[PDB]
Structures are given as C-alpha cells and as structure tokens.
Amino acid sequence: PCPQDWIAHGENCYLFSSGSFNWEKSQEKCLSLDAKLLKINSTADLDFIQQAISYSSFPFWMGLSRRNPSYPWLWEDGSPLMPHLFRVRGAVSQTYPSGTCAYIQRGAVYAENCILAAFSICQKKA
Numbered sequence: 001p002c003p004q005d006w007i008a009h010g011e012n013c014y015l016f017s018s019g020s021f022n023w024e025k026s027q028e029k030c031l032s033l034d035a036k037l038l039k040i041n042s043t044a045d046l047d048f049i050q051q052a053i054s055y056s057s058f059p060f061w062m063g064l065s066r067r068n069p070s071y072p073w074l075w076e077d078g079s080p081l082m083p084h085l086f087r088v089r090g091a092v093s094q095t096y097p098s099g100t101c102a103y104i105q106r107g108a109v110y111a112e113n114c115i116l117a118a119f120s121i122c123q124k125k126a
Contacts, residue, residue, distance in 0.1 A: 002126055009048040014038070015122045016052070016060070023101040023114040026061045027076065030122035037063030038121040039075045046085055049121065050107045057106060061120035064088075064102035068095040073102065 002013035017029060030037050040046050040062060053060065063076040073081045073088060081088075088102055090110030101114040 007052055008126060010044070011125055012123050013126050014049075014052065017120045017122065020058075020117045020119045022098075022117055023061050023065065023120075024098070026118070026120035027063070030120065033122060033124070035122035035124040036076050037061060038123055039063050039077070039079075040085060041082060043085060049104065052121075053104070053107070059103040059105040059110075059112075059118040061101060061103045061118045062109075065099055065114065067099040069093050069100070 002008045006013040006015045008014075015030075015033065015035065017026060019029070021029065027037055038049065038060075040049065064073050064081060065076075066073050069092060075081070086109045088109050088111050090112055091100065092111045094100070094113075096113040096115070098114045100111050102109055102111050103118050104110075
C-alpha cells in the first residue's frame with residue numbers, strides 16, 4: 001500500500017526525486033519525506049531498481065558513501081555494503097572535501113564527489 005507517487009517492492013516504497021541536487025541536499029530531501037536514500041541490500045533490490053530506471057541515462061544518488069578511500073563504503077544507517085551485489089566504479093580513489101558518494105547510472109554503480117548534482121531515489125517502509 002505505497003503512498004501516492006511511490007513504487008512498491010518488497011517491504012518498501014520507492015520514490016524518484018523530482019529534483020537533481022548534491023548528495024547532501026538529496027539526503028535532506030528524502031528525510032523531509034520521512035524517507036532515506038536508497039539502500040540496496042540484495043540482488044532483487046538491484047534489479048528492481050535497474051528496471052524502474054527504465055533506461056534513463058541520468059545519474060541517481062543512493063545512500064552509500066564514505067569520506068575518503070581509507071573508510072569502507074557504508075549505507076546512511078552505518079551498515080556495510082553486502083558483498084555480492086555490485087562493484088563501485090568511478091572515482092573511488094580521490095579524496096574530496098565533502099566525501100565520495102555512490103550513484104547508479106546506465107545500471108552500473110559509480111563513485112563521485114558528493115557536491116555534484118544528480119537525481120536520487122528515496123525509500124521508506126510500506
């Protein structure tokens with residue numbers, strides 16, 4: 001029973017943000033909706049999301065981040081990235097003043113400087 005404009009999968013509801021902003025604003029935008037940025041915990045999650053994106057070439061922030069390459073990638077809640085899901089491609093090895101953040105684009109996952117603008121996906125429980 002997902003709210004108005006949200007998409008159901010598993011326990012959760014999913015929203016494609018209407019705006020494209022940096023990671024920090026995107027995070028605050030999901031929190032504003034009593035939601036959080038996407039957290040992919042399974043292969044099913046990954047393919048649901050890959051499908052929902054419908055061959056958009058836009059980038060879509062998820063809730064995965066780290067402040068420099070000497071920290072593990074963690075979801076917003078502090079949980080780790082589960083191992084058999086995706087490789088994080090992109091700018092994995094530079095250090096940016098506001099951290100490195102993961103997004104999904106063309107079905108693959110990439111790391112970039114958190115101040116760059118992207119669409120995002122929020123989630124909350126149904």
